[PDB]
Amino acid sequence: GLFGAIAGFIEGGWTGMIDGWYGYHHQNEQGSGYAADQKSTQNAIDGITNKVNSVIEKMNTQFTAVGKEFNNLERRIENLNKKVDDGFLDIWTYNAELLVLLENERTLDFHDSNVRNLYEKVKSQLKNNAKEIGNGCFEFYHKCDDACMESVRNGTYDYPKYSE
Amino acid sequence: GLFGAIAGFIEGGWTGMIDGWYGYHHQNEQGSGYAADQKSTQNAIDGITNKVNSVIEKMNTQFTAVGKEFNNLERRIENLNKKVDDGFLDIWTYNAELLVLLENERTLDFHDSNVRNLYEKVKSQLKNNAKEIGNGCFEFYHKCDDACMESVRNGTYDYPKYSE
Amino acid sequence: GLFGAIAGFIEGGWTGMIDGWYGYHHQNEQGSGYAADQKSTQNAIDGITNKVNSVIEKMNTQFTAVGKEFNNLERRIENLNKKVDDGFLDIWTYNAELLVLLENERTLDFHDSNVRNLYEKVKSQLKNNAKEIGNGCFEFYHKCDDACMESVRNGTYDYPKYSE
Amino acid sequence: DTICIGYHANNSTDTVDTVLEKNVTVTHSVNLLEDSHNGKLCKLKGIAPLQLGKCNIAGWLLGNPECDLLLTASSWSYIVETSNSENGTCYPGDFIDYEELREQLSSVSSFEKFEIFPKTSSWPNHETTGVTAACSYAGASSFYRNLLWLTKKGSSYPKLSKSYVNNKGKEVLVLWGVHHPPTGTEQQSLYQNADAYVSVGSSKYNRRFTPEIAARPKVRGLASRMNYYWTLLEPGDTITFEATGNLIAPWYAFALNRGSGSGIITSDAPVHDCNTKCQTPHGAINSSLPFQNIHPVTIGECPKYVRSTKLRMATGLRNIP
Amino acid sequence: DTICIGYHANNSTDTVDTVLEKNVTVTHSVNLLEDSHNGKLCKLKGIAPLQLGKCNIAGWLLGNPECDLLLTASSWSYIVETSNSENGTCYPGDFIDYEELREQLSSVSSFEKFEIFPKTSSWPNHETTGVTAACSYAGASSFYRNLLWLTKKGSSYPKLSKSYVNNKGKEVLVLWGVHHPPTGTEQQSLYQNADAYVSVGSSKYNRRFTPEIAARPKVRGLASRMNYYWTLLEPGDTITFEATGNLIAPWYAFALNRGSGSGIITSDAPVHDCNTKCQTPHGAINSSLPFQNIHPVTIGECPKYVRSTKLRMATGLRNIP
Amino acid sequence: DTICIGYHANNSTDTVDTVLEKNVTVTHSVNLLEDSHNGKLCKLKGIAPLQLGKCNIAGWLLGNPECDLLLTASSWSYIVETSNSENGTCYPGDFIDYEELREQLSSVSSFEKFEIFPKTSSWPNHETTGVTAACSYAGASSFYRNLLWLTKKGSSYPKLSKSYVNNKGKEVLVLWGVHHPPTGTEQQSLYQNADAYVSVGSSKYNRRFTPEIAARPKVRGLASRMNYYWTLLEPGDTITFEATGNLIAPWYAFALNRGSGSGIITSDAPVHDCNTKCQTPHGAINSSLPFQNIHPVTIGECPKYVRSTKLRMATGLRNIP
Numbered sequence A, B, C: 001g002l003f004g005a006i007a008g009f010i011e012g013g014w015t016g017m018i019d020g021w022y023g024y025h026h027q028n029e030q031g032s033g034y035a036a037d038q039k040s041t042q043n044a045i046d047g048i049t050n051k052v053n054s055v056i057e058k059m060n061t062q063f064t065a066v067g068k069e070f071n072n073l074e075r076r077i078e079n080l081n082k083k084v085d086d087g088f089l090d091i092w093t094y095n096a097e098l099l100v101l102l103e104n105e106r107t108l109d110f111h112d113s114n115v116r117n118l119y120e121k122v123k124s125q126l127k128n129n130a131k132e133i134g135n136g137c138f139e140f141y142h143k144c145d146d147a148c149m150e151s152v153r154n155g156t157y158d159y160p161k162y163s164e
Numbered sequence D, E, F: 001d002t003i004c005i006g007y008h009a010n011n012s013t014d015t016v017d018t019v020l021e022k023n024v025t026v027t028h029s030v031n032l033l034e035d036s037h038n039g040k041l042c043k044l045k046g047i048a049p050l051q052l053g054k055c056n057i058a059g060w061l062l063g064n065p066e067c068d069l070l071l072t073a074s075s076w077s078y079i080v081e082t083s084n085s086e087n088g089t090c091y092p093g094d095f096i097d098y099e100e101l102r103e104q105l106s107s108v109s110s111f112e113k114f115e116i117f118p119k120t121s122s123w124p125n126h127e128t129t130g131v132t133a134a135c136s137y138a139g140a141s142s143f144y145r146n147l148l149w150l151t152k153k154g155s156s157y158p159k160l161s162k163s164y165v166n167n168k169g170k171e172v173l174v175l176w177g178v179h180h181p182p183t184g185t186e187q188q189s190l191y192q193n194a195d196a197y198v199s200v201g202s203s204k205y206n207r208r209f210t211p212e213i214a215a216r217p218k219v220r221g222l223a224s225r226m227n228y229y230w231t232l233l234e235p236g237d238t239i240t241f242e243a244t245g246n247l248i249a250p251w252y253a254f255a256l257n258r259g260s261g262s263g264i265i266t267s268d269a270p271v272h273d274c275n276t277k278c279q280t281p282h283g284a285i286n287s288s289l290p291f292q293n294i295h296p297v298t299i300g301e302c303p304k305y306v307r308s309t310k311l312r313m314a315t316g317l318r319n320i321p
Ligand SMILES: *[C@@H]1O[C@H](CO)[C@@H](O[C@@H]2O[C@H](CO)[C@@H](O[C@@H]3O[C@H](CO)[C@@H](O)[C@H](O)[C@@H]3O)[C@H](O)[C@H]2NC(C)=O)[C@H](O)[C@H]1NC(C)=O
Pocket: F064, F065, F066, F086, F087, F089, F090, F133, F134, F135, F136, F220
């Protein structure tokens, strides 16, 4: 990955998380489970949806009959007409192919970016109250219940709470 | 943001700074004020100026009369001529539309990139001589006057003078 | 640089490393030398190789005779034929120019990214067992031999051995 | 206790291509390329196409005997010819500006056939009964339904003059023909006049025709030839026929309003009552996507034709289960 | 004490669209699309266009009595016709290769009209005074200014032979016509000869014209027709007219050096002394930008025509005050 | 006690352009633009081009006396004309649909010349010996090698009828001509008949020619003209010539299989035995790259033509030694 998160230091994805693209996996006294961050997920959805719609909706065409008929003494303008149709084919095929190749690359980087952004927003909040393992996991040096976990997920986590 | 600074952990811009795109807000015993970073601002300007000039000047045009006249027994080549003109319209419209959408996205990410680069350029020199508050602000663990401030902006700031 | 590594906090390149794009320079008691990371280099090569092949091979080419001959009463369709040839000329020139401009920028950013990814891949393993100087150099708080250096390059480095 | 940062993964087998890497498996994707058609020929802009059955545009217009079971509408958005349209001009010769006429008739909003020169009262001194084995229908010699073969009545072909003024308030399409005998003996056998001529004129049209007499290879058994000419008569304009022989006279003509920017489709696909914004000879397609691999030749507002077998756009992220 | 890292903001209301997000407000932007024209028809390559006033190219060339001649400029970079140019050939008939001739006259350097066959000394044995009510000037019957109508003198029309050698060191455009009477009686009334011809030839041009006589509808009161023919005579070459009748003789001709790659614009917009590199029928535009939505049909070095209402390129960053 | 992270650098002087910055020096790069040609005209798809030497296609086909071909090659992938092809029709006149004929003969896989109407046994009732000073070989008056000039025998020119059936299993190109005398005196002098005509016909071709008699400027000493006509005769089809005079009869014809999508190149570059997939008038180029600035007009499978002087794609990274 360009930003080094997806297929980066975070090695794999979670099949266990069905409600969003990006999220958290908490494990504590009460149990373990998956929860998706809806802000980062919804923002990504809105972005990609605008991207797909842009590629589709910016295409507008006027009513045209491509076919043309020529007799055996008209061969030259028949080949001219063929050069036009073939020319538009060469142009549109080449551009479409690359447009997908390039934007597929950009889309994956957009996801890669969002995952890293989410990671270091959490790093920023936890600071030294947790251990940075690598693999996208933070091991708490204190007790964190579902109320405490949600504070991290909500971005409301309180650092000057846990000295412990 | 792609790089997570603009509209990122740094939440907003400064209306008080008119001398550049990116800059610093200094506050100390001697006073407070805004100062723009000239290296990063000028490079960004040069880059964007080169981008705009590229989009405009890479277009080369030859003197052309688009219009053509045909009589009523020429109907086929009149429609051939229309297919050519309509074809270039479909191509140029679609490409221009996407070219702007895509490069606007890249331009904003370029700004997002420059802000973070400036941020971690300052962080790298200060190290533990300052505390990371967030929102792009550093609290000094020592005393810094206007002479010390200029050192940060100049990249000449001395860490092993300030443990104090 | 977009990722701030090449021409970034790492100020320059190594002429002494000929075996790869990205790598390490080790310095210790036993000696000094250069070594290239083969995974990040090969991945970059494969990526860039796919980019170059894409731009060239996505071009579809059919046998075509562009030239056409017209007599002195055919002038209108001669200029029509000229508008077609010139139209394809304007389109292909403009798109090709930007395609190179835009993808050259992305290619350079791609290398900048890879250098940073490698840097922070190394930082994560060493953690506090080494000091971060800058310019892409880490000073060990312990003694590291040629076997230990290879541990860093291979990503197999063992943290719970060297602590003191 | 532990909290972890991660991303979605699933059983998705979908794959896309990127500039750096081929065949990347992703969690979600959308298709930008239309790969499917309905295998039907549908209505364009709410109107069905013209179906000529066993006949092509030439045969239909001239009234080829095999074209008389056709049911044509007042209007059509385009014209459909099939592999089964074999019946053109049954009498060998050149159809002048034929490709042009086809192009110009591709779409019409008001179409009526009417009798321009009534068979009964128009030609009292000439024989209208001429037929040929070349135009045979059901094993019997016949002729065009919309034209009349004028020959001498009882020893002479008096100079004829007939004019039509266009009161239809729209363009009238007038078709006629000129017959060229292989020998001078046949020329006098039919029209009696060696010096015979055909002259046709209007405000926008003027021409003169003389019988070209010569030996030619037999086509459909005939060494003779018959050439076909047409003109679009403006509203209010008059057309005048004068001939001393060799004229194939207009019987029925067509009054019409031409559309624009349409064409002809050659397809064996069945015509149905469905609707579409884009028509291909293979079938109708959905115009919502920017690209289609269905057919290079289309009629409508259509996605651009590309050689691509696959265009697939990554929406989701890399799938790593 | 504190130092902070931040970015610019202002009161800018400028907005752009991005692939991910619509209508992002930015601090600075530039416009890539020219949406405005000056509503004037300006000079191309420093030269003003040809203005034909009440007449079209046909009327101007042939010298229609209602047009303005000899006021034609030495050169023009293109031709302007208006909705008010209705006066073409006043004598009904076909102008052959009319569209081609127009294209080749679209831009010319060194343009002068001259008398190729002076009315006084050219035709001693034929009557030059023929006029017509169809070509009217000031309520009186008249004729084309650049052509001369030759009719019989005293019951005879002797074979005429007239040649012009081009010494002008540039291309000479020669226009002429052939008159076709409605009846054979009128043919003999004017030109005296039932068997008649017009023959025109040069090194690169050969053709023959014969009086095709037929009944046709009255156009502008005339059942007669007049066809107009032209050729561009190369320097040093000779052109020879021979006729036994039916010739409408060249009176005035045009010597010129043809330009290339220009065209004709139809616009009612006023012509002024301004300059531009791109002209549209709506008006002149700035050619500095890559794209324009004003009009697809232009003459000059012009921005590419697009359907875009807005193309705006972000320079600055997201504005967050 | 130190490990460092860094990147490659070298002696590379290569520079590329980016959207943000000009002339960035990189360690490695590839070139996407073909800037070079071999300055030769080579074989296309393994087949050499047709070389006409001193003559153009018209002169070669008609068999102009100065055109030395012991045999026209059996096949060619395209046709090369040089600045040294000055000899077309040596007898002044128009070659009809000349551009079309050239286009359709651009590539052939089977080409043979044969005697369609043998000079000796074909025309017993007409004199075949006519020649002209305009067509001269070795200082003596001559004629086309592939055509035969038919004139009256002993003050009589009986109607001639001649047919050829095509058994060659491929297309036969039949050329002929029609002679147009300057005076009526000459018409009777050569063909004896003023009312003379030429008729040519087949299944797919029919046309008639009459002598146009007129005074013309002398071209190559002749006030007379000769028009040249051609038709491609289908396998199995017959062509029939009928004339009362003025016919320039086919002597030799060509049997062939047309290729498609080829053209004519005009270049003085030397023709060699090399091979290429792309030919330009400047020379052959390698087609492996997507773009070339050599020339817009090409024949082959070729890179797209652009005016770009430099397209260079960064592969490596910014070079900083
Ligand atoms: C084949 O091409 C050559 C040249 O391309 C023709 O040879 C001669 O070309 C010259 C032009 O440089 C002609 O000049 C004429 O010379 C005569 C005196 O001999 C003069 O009276 C004329 O006014 C003119 O200057 C010359 O006619 C021409 N040769 C002949 C025999 O006409 C050659 O004619 C070409 N072959 C054929 C069959 O046309």
